[PDB]
Structure 1
Amino acid sequence: PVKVCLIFAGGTGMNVATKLVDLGEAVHCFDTCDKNVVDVHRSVNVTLTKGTRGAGGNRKVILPLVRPQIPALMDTIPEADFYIVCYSLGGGSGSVLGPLITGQLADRKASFVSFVVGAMESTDNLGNDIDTMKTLEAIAVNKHLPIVVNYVPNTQGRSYESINDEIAEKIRKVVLLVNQNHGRLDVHDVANWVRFTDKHNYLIPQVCELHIETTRKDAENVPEAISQLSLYLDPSKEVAFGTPIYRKVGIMKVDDLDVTDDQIHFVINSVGVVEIMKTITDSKLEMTRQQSKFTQRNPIIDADDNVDEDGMVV
Structure 2
Amino acid sequence: PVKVCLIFAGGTGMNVATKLVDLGEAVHCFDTCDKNVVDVHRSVNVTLTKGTRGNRKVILPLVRPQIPALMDTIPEADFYIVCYSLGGGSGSVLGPLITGQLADRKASFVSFVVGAMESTDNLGNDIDTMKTLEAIAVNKHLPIVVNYVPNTQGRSYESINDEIAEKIRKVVLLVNQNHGRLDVHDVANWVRFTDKHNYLIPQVCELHIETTRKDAENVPEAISQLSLYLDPSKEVAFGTPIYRKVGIMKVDDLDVTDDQIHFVINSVGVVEIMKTITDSKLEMTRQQSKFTQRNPIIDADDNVDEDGMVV
Q: Which TM-score bucket, shorter chain as reference? A: over 0.9
Q: CA deviation at 1:310?
A: 4.5
Deviation string 1:166-213 (CA, Å, 9 cap, x unpaired) is 000000000000001100000000000000000011000000000000
Deviation string 1:239-271 (CA, Å, 9 cap, x unpaired) is 011100001000001111101101000000000
Q: Provide the rounded CA distance (Å) in 2 between the counterparts of 1:272 and 1:310.
A: 55
Does the aligned pair in 2 maintain the 1:13–1:29 contact within 8 Å?
Answer: yes
Q: Aligned to 1:247, what secondary structure does the other structure show?
A: strand
Q: Aligned to 1:85, what secondary structure does the other structure show?
A: strand
Q: Provide the rounded CA distance (Å) in 2 between the counterparts of 1:306 and 1:137.
A: 55
After TM superposition, the score normalised by the length of structure 1 is 0.97
Q: Aligned to 1:224, what secondary structure does the other structure show?
A: coil
Moved more, 63-72 or 284-293: 284-293
Q: CA deviation at 1:287?
A: 2.7
Q: CA deviation at 1:303?
A: 1.8
Q: Provide the rounded CA distance (Å) in 2 between the counterparts of 1:159 and 1:2.
A: 34
Deviation string 1:68-94 (CA, Å, 9 cap, x unpaired) is 000000000000000000000000000
Does the aligned pair in 2 maintain the 1:126–1:283 contact within 8 Å?
Answer: no
Q: Provide the rounded CA distance (Å) in 1 between the counterparts of 2:286 and 2:82.
A: 34
Q: Provide the rounded CA distance (Å) in 2 between the counterparts of 1:286 and 1:25.
A: 45
Structure 1, unpaired ranges of 5+ = none
Moved more, 63-72 or 291-300: 291-300
2:300 is aligned to 303
Q: CA deviation at 1:301?
A: 1.8
Q: Aligned to 1:84, what secondary structure does the other structure show?
A: strand
Q: CA deviation at 1:308?
A: 4.0
Moved more, 278-287 or 83-92: 278-287
Q: Provide the rounded CA distance (Å) in 2 between the counterparts of 1:272 and 1:281.
A: 15
Q: Aligned to 2:168, what secondary structure does the other structure show?
A: helix
Q: CA deviation at 1:295?
A: 1.6
Q: CA deviation at 1:293?
A: 1.3
Give the count of matched residue pairs. 311
Q: Aligned to 1:248, what secondary structure does the other structure show?
A: strand
After TM superposition, the score normalised by the length of structure 2 is 0.98
Deviation string 1:89-123 (CA, Å, 9 cap, x unpaired) is 00000000000000000000000000000000011
Q: CA deviation at 1:281?
A: 1.6
Deviation string 1:14-53 (CA, Å, 9 cap, x unpaired) is 0000000000000000000011000001100000111111
Q: Provide the rounded CA distance (Å) in 1 between the counterparts of 2:307 and 2:239.
A: 72
1:105 is aligned to 102
Deviation string 1:144-177 (CA, Å, 9 cap, x unpaired) is 1000000000000100000001000000000000
Q: CA deviation at 1:294?
A: 1.3
Q: Provide the rounded CA distance (Å) in 1 between the counterparts of 2:241 and 2:221.
A: 7
Q: CA deviation at 1:132?
A: 0.3
Q: Aligned to 1:92, what secondary structure does the other structure show?
A: coil
Q: CA deviation at 1:285?
A: 2.0
Q: CA deviation at 1:313?
A: 3.4
Q: CA deviation at 1:309?
A: 4.4
| Percent of matched pairs sharing the same residue | 100
1:157 is aligned to 154
1:48 is aligned to 48
Q: Provide the rounded CA distance (Å) in 2 between the counterparts of 1:183 and 1:72.
A: 38
Does the aligned pair in 2 maintain the 1:89–1:132 contact within 8 Å?
Answer: yes
Q: CA deviation at 1:289?
A: 2.5
1:137 is aligned to 134
Alignment partner of 1:116 is 2:113: yes
Does the aligned pair in 2 maintain the 1:145–1:206 contact within 8 Å?
Answer: yes
Structure 2, unpaired ranges of 5+ = none
Q: Aligned to 2:302, what secondary structure does the other structure show?
A: coil
Q: CA deviation at 1:297?
A: 1.7
